[PDB]
RNA sequence: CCCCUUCGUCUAGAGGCCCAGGACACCGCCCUUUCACGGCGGUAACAGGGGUUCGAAUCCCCUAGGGG
């Protein structure tokens, strides 16, 4: 029994089940997440008998890091071992903050055409310990909170491999741990779950946890979205934005706005005609816009909008009063930029034959 | 017998620099451009009780909880 699979409720449960008081769950979480301890013999403020009781009944096993790559950006990407397979995790330092992109499945069940995770197939969901484990290893490797004196991580984004809303069972507990004060103590506002639009699971999310929301929109109408982000064929743009607005109603994390992700595919969806449509489309949705220049990956039929097109496109949106930021491209030299995470996946869907 | 207990969390603190300071969280406002969620602001603690002293988070006692 591995305590990295457990959130606070559950660890309390666990400690009651050992005839021991529930504040013990707070102590152990502090060692685990504030110091990145994987070793009960260091928990100096737990009496020696219980300290030993734990070693018999439980453990703290994060997946192992088996690769590391540094970019001129400063950006780092670690590959973690997940049985025979690998998912990948990205650390992004900016001046006043540090951000971890976290993987949430082994590949992705979805088929976005501009995504490299999509082109590897899909194997399985990640367990809680394999999600929060990514935040655990990255915190230890960077410099643990009460070990260097600084928060190693200030923001997390569920923007690694996989679609988060197709693994709510594990995504939510893991986000719960991130937010927890005896966990990493991060902020609602600085944990951004991004989703391609699995509407029912978003409604479900609303009833489970309040967390900042971004959406992989990527087109200004269904005819295009059908082609690049195929799940649109099952939950279309209007259905999705309705769901989004349902989430935003009951959410402090988002501060009344959703972040719109829109990847910039050269001469596909990135002309000023599209910006005009996009502005219209979003007239009834309080948001801010994040333009993402496309990051390439082997075999793709696409190209990256030139900066002139991006610049023009963004200015149209700005005419209509939208906050429009171009996401700086980070980790491209090591295939760690958004979309480039292929990991190592044993596809179980036969993505190839088809 | 000895040591520890200060906002949600980690802490600042040595008889007056403290009706308790910071960071983060939380909450609020704003995002018509700081964004791989951004800017600003605000609420919030001396474990509980009794003493010593002009004055106690700080010194003494008792209690509860925790460690050797
Ligand atoms: C994580 C964010 O990046 C987007 N995304 C997926 N693939 C790529 C790529 N090759 N380049 C840029 N962005 C991508 C997702 O659709 C999501 O919005
Ligand atoms: C590479 S995408 C990562 C998060 C989710 N799949 C989304 O597309 O928004
Ligand atoms: S984009 Fe998000 S959803 Fe679409 S494939 Fe890549 S990962 Fe899966
Ligand atoms: Mg929190
Ligand atoms: Mg306390
Ligand atoms: Mg102190
Ligand atoms: Mg924000």
Asked whether the beta carbons of A170 and A206 are under 8 A apart, the reply is: no
Distance A150 CA to B23 C1' (A): 10
Which residues are bridge partners to A81 per DSSP?
A86
Quick check: CB of A269 below 6 Å from ligand 1?
Answer: no
Shortest-distance Cα residue to atom 9 of ligand 2: A195
- Closest nucleotide (C1' vs CA) to A156 is B36
Count of beta carbons in the 10 Å neighbourhood of residue A160: 26
Count of beta carbons in the 10 Å neighbourhood of residue A39: 11
Radius of gyration over every alpha carbon of chain A, rounded to an integer in angstroms = 21
Residue A220 tokens, joined: 């200004």
**Ligand 6 centroid distance, CA of A23 (Å):** 21
Checking DSSP bridges between strand A105-107 and strand A97-101, what pairing results, if any? Answer: unpaired
- Closest nucleotide (C1' vs CA) to A26 is B9
The rounded distance, in Å, linking the Cα atoms of A127 and A316 is: 43
Which residues are bridge partners to A79 per DSSP?
A67, A88
- Closest nucleotide (C1' vs CA) to A326 is B35
The rounded distance, in Å, linking the Cα atoms of A301 and A159 is: 22
Q: A302-311 long-range CB contacts below 8 Å, 24 or more apart?
A: A302/A113, A302/A114, A302/A265, A302/A266, A302/A268, A303/A265, A303/A266, A303/A267, A304/A264, A304/A265, A304/A266, A305/A264, A305/A265, A305/A266, A305/A267, A305/A270, A306/A266, A309/A264, A309/A266, A309/A270, A309/A271, A310/A264, A310/A270
Q: Which atom of ligand 2 is nearest to the CA of A158?
A: 4
A205 sits within 7 Å of strand B by its CB: no
The rounded distance, in Å, linking the Cα atoms of A249 and A190 is: 18
The rounded distance, in Å, linking the Cα atoms of A70 and A333 is: 9
Nucleotides of B under 7 A from a protein CB: 8-11, 24-39, 66-68
Closest CA to A46 of A26, A66, A62, A61: A26
Asked whether the beta carbons of A212 and A188 are under 8 A apart, the reply is: yes
Quick check: CB of A194 below 6 Å from ligand 1?
Answer: yes
Closest CA to A76 of A303, A334, A347, A354: A334
Residue A22 tokens, joined: 């529930």
- Closest nucleotide (C1' vs CA) to A179 is B25
In chain A, positions 86-105 with C-beta closer than 7 Å to nucleic chain B are 90, 92, 94, 96-97, 99, 101
Domain ranges across chain A:
1-61, 62-354
Q: Which residue ranges of A are tagged as binding site for [4Fe-4S] cluster?
A: 108, 112, 115
Say whether domain A62-354 belongs to CATH 3.20.20.70: yes
Task: Check if A338 is active-site.
Answer: yes
**Which of A36, A37, A287, A338 does the annotation list as catalytic?**
A338
Phi and psi for A72 in degrees, rounded to 5? -50, -30
Checking DSSP bridges between strand A324-326 and strand A97-101, what pairing results, if any? Answer: unpaired
Which residues, 6 or more positions from A128, have their beta carbon under 8 angstroms from its beta carbon? A4, A5, A6, A7, A170, A173, A174, A177
Say whether domain A1-61 belongs to CATH 1.10.3720.10: no
Distances (CA, A) of A118 to A129, A165, A215, A329: 23, 16, 17, 20
Closest CA to A71 of A260, A329, A289, A301: A329
**Which of A36, A88, A176, A287 does the annotation list as catalytic?**
A88
Which residues are bridge partners to A258 per DSSP?
A287
Residue A172 tokens, joined: 């939510």
* 3-class secondary structure per residue, chain A: CEHHHCCHHHHHHHHHCCCCCCCHHHHHHHHHHHCCCCCHHHCCCCCHHHHHHHHHHCECCCCCEEEEEECCCCCEEEEEEECCEEEEEEEEEECCEEEEECCCEEECCCCCCCCHHHHCCEEEECCHHHHHHHHHHHHHHHCCHHHHCCCCCCEEEECCCCCHHHCHHHHHHHHHHHHCCCCCCCCHHHEEEEECCCHHHHHHHHCCCCCEEEEECCCCCHHHHHHHCHHHHCCCHHHHHHHHHHHHHCCCCCCCCEEEEEEEECCCCCCHHHHHHHHHHCCCCCEEEEEEECCCCCCCCCCECCHHHHHHHHHHHHHCCCCEEECCCCCHHHCCCCCCCCCECCCCCCCCCC
Q: Which residue has the tokens 């999310």?
A: A205
Closest CA to A33 of A133, A149, A110: A133
Residue A234 tokens, joined: 């099952």
Which residues are bridge partners to A212 per DSSP?
A192
A252 sits within 7 Å of strand B by its CB: yes
The rounded distance, in Å, linking the Cα atoms of A173 and A65 is: 22
Distance A189 CA to B29 C1' (A): 15
Residue A72 tokens, joined: 């001129």
The rounded distance, in Å, linking the Cα atoms of A277 and A330 is: 28
Distances (CA, A) of A14 to A5, A47, A49: 12, 18, 17
CB contact burial A273-299 (16+ within 10 A = b; e otherwise): ebbbbbbebbeebebebbbbbbbbbee
Quick check: CB of A159 below 6 Å from ligand 1?
Answer: yes
- The residue count for chain A: 354
The rounded distance, in Å, linking the Cα atoms of A149 and A156 is: 19
Checking DSSP bridges between strand A65-70 and strand A76-82, what pairing results, if any? Answer: antiparallel
The experimental resolution of this structure, in angstroms, equals 2.9
Burial of A238 per CB tally in 10 Å (0-12, 13-18, 19+):
exposed
Task: Give the side-chain half-sphere CA count within 13 A for A132.
Answer: 31
**Ligand 5 centroid distance, CA of A182 (Å):** 13
Task: Check if A37 is active-site.
Answer: no
Name the experiment that determined this structure: X-ray
Q: Which residue's CA is nearest to the C1' of nucleotide B30?
A: A255
The rounded distance, in Å, linking the Cα atoms of A256 and A207 is: 17
Distances (CA, A) of A244 to A101, A219, A278, A304, A339: 22, 16, 16, 28, 23
The rounded distance, in Å, linking the Cα atoms of A57 and A239 is: 47
**Region for A270 from its dihedrals, namely left if φ exceeds 0, alpha if ψ lies in -120 to 50, beta otherwise:** alpha
């Amino acid at each position: 029994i591995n305590l990295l699979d457990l959130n606070r409720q559950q660890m309390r449960e666990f400690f009651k089940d050992l005839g021991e008081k529930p504040f013990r769950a707070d102590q152990v979480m502090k060692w685990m997440y504030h110091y990145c301890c994987d070793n009960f013999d260091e928990m100096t403020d737990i009496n020696k008998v219980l300290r030993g009781k734990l070693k018999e009944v439980a453990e703290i096993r994060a997946p192992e890091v088996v690769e590391e790559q540094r970019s001129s950006d400063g950006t780092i990407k670690w590959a973690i071992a997940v049985g025979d397979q690998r998912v990948e995790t990205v650390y992004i330092p900016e001046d006043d903050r540090a951000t971890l992109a976290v993987s949430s499945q082994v590949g992705c069940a979805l088929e976005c055409k501009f995504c490299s995770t999509a082109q590897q197939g899909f194997n399985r969901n990640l367990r809680v310990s394999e999600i929060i484990g990514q935040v655990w290893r990255a915190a230890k490797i960077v410099g643990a909170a009460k070990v260097t004196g600084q928060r190693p991580i200030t923001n997390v984004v569920m923007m690694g491999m996989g679609e988060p809303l197709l693994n709510l069972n594990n995504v939510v507990p893991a986000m719960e741990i991130m937010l927890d004060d005896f966990g990493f103590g991060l902020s609602k506002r600085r944990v951004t779950l991004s989703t391609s639009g699995v509407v029912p699971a978003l409604d479900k999310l609303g009833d489970m946890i309040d967390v900042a929301l971004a959406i992989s929109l990527h087109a200004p109408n269904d005819e295009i979205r059908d082609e690049i982000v195929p799940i649109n064929k099952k939950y279309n743009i209007e259905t999705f934005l309705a769901a989004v607005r349902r989430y935003l109603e009951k959410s402090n994390a988002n501060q009344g706005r959703v972040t719109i992700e829109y990847v910039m595919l050269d001469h596909v969806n990135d002309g000023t005609e599209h910006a005009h449509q996009l502005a219209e489309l979003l007239k009834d949705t309080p948001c801010k816009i994040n333009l993402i220049p496309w990051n390439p990956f082997p075999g793709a039929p696409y190209g990256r909008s030139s900066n002139s097109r991006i610049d023009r496109f963004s200015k149209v949106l700005m005419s209509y009063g939208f906050t429009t930021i171009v996401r700086k491209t980070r980790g491209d030299d090591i295939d760690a930029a958004c979309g480039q995470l292929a990991g190592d996946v044993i596809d179980r869907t036969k993505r190839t034959l088809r």
